[PDB]
């Protein structure tokens, strides 16, 4: 019901499907494909289109020569000769800088925490159309389902400011506090918790070793499930301290949720954390209203 649907308001963007063209690279041994993202006069193509290792990539890309062998990358639209490899992205100018309408850019995407949209071009079985999906993002990590090929999908905040491009994922994550090297309350998490990962147009990506993330592969380590700080505090206060009596900060909020003392006192959602720990399993497997715990720490109690 509406009681459990965040029902987030996202600003309608007038964007053509050509803002997110499907690019395909086909060889004798492989087919690879993703979406380019046409942003303010330039198309952005994630380089792993040409391979997922340095040697393989450099050979197929061939200093931009490889671009001549990509479908849906016509010289008529893009100035191929002026292609530039910037970090993990291939940037090519539009021949006509005005051919695709420009969009708003978020000034610090990896700092954003909250609702997002994912835009992806799709072919509808009778045209290629732009498709939108709603979800949540925490510092470049989101919860919108993707499949291989969805790289290049464009992620926006609710005001229509571009956050970045979808680029990676995982079936599961390891939970721990990497800052302290300690396990936390989420380490024993029994269900698979997949990751969905974004990269910005300035090659910012919330992973260790961002410079060549696309050529390497490690385990993905989370400190906690995807969460908003205010929403998490509201949720915990409701479960453990219904009258919200002022209770002191429990330092395990930092290790378990990466919530600081400053944030705790700032928001004024007071928590009996001992109560949360002693009823952890019940609180994380039973609903608040009809809302899951994981939904609640993202979106709030929606009351």
């Amino acid at each position: 019901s509406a009681a459990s649907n965040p029902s987030i308001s996202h600003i309608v963007l007038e964007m053509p499907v050509a803002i997110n063209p499907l690019i395909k690279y086909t060889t004798r041994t492989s087919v690879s494909s993703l979406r380019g993202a046409v942003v303010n006069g330039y198309i952005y193509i994630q380089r792993h289109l040409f391979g997922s290792k340095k040697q393989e990539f450099e050979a197929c890309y061939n200093n931009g020569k490889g671009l001549l062998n990509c479908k849906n990358l016509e010289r008529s639209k893009y100035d191929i000769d002026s292609a530039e490899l910037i970090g993990t992205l291939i940037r090519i100018p539009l021949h006509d800088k005005h051919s695709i309408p420009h969009i708003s850019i978020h000034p610090d995407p990896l700092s954003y925490n909250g609702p997002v949209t994912l835009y992806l071009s799709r072919y509808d079985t009778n045209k290629d159309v732009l498709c939108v999906h709603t979800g949540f993002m925490s510092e470049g990590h989101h919860d919108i389902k993707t499949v291989f090929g969805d790289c290049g999908g464009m992620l926006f905040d609710p005001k229509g400011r571009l956050l970045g491009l979808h680029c990676a994922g995982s079936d599961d994550v390891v939970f721990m506090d990497t800052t302290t090297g300690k396990s936390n309350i989420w380490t024993s998490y029994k269900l698979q918790h997949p990751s969905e990962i974004m990269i910005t147009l300035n090659n910012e990506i919330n992973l260790p070793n961002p410079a060549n993330y696309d050529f390497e592969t490690t385990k993905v380590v989370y400190q906690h499930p995807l969460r908003n700080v205010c929403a998490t505090l509201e949720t915990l206060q409701h479960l453990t301290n219904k009258t919200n009596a002022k209770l002191p900060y429990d330092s395990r909020l930092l290790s378990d949720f990466n919530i600081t003392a400053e944030q705790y006192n700032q928001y004024g959602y007071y928590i009996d954390y001992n109560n949360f720990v002693n009823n952890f399993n019940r609180y994380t497997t039973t609903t608040i209203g009809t809302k899951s715990f994981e939904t609640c720490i993202k979106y709030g109690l929606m009351d």
């Binding site: 997922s52 990676a168 995982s170 390497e216 592969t217 385990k219």
Partner: peptide, 4 residues
């Protein structure tokens, strides 16, 4: 850890 995989590219999409």
């Amino acid at each position: 850890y995989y590219n999409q």
